[PDB]
């Protein structure tokens, strides 16, 4: 049974939030 | 050396020909001819003048690794 498009968009949004947190940690480690 | 040993002994075991490792690993020409030369025939034919197949990415990466290795020299 294949995934749905909404599931992929949900995963992309969660990964975008994770990327925002990654940028925050990278800035905090830099300075 | 370790992974060459693992791969050749298991290749002989998986092909059902245990005697190939037993009768050719005792000398280094056996290693060269019956492991490197013999088992690279399908890999280097991944693309040829007659066409290509699914191993063509591995032939290209094979040459790619040879080139990167040479550039380090």
């Amino acid at each position: 049974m294949p995934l749905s498009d909404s599931q992929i968009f949900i995963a992309l949004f969660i990964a975008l939030l994770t990327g925002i947190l990654a940028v925050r940690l990278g800035l905090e480690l830099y300075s | 050396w370790v992974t060459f040993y693992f791969h050749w002994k298991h290749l002989g075991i998986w092909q059902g020909n245990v005697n190939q490792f037993n009768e050719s690993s005792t000398y280094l020409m056996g290693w060269l001819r019956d492991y490197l030369w013999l088992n690279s025939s399908q890999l280097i034919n991944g693309y040829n003048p007659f066409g290509m197949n699914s191993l063509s990415v591995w032939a290209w990466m094979f040459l790619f690794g040879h080139l990167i290795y040479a550039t380090g020299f």
Partner: protein, 73 residues
Amino acid sequence: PQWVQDPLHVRPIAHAIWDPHFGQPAVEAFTRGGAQGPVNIATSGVYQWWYTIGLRTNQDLFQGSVFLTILSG
């Protein structure tokens, strides 16, 4: 799921291929007579591990991926 049904006669798929530099014989060779388009056949053995630990469907793998993304965040 197709690998779960036939673990001895199905090659596990790593991910899809989208390469605009591909020619048509490259598209058909990496399709391997399937319907998912050009794919890479996985060598990592994640299919056997995930099958052994009880995952069966694509939904379970997707839920695990979402959970691990949340854990990374």
